[PDB]
């Protein structure tokens, strides 16, 4: 789950990067 998020903290980046 650990690198789990890491995936999604990575695809949310953008996500964030966005707002």
Same mark, same amino acid.
């Given at each position: 789950? &650990?690198?789990?998020?890491?995936?999604?903290?990575? &695809?949310?980046?953008? &996500? &964030?990067?966005?707002?």
């Amino acid at each position: 789950f &650990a690198s789990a998020x890491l995936q999604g903290a990575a &695809a949310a980046a953008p &996500a &964030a990067a966005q707002w």
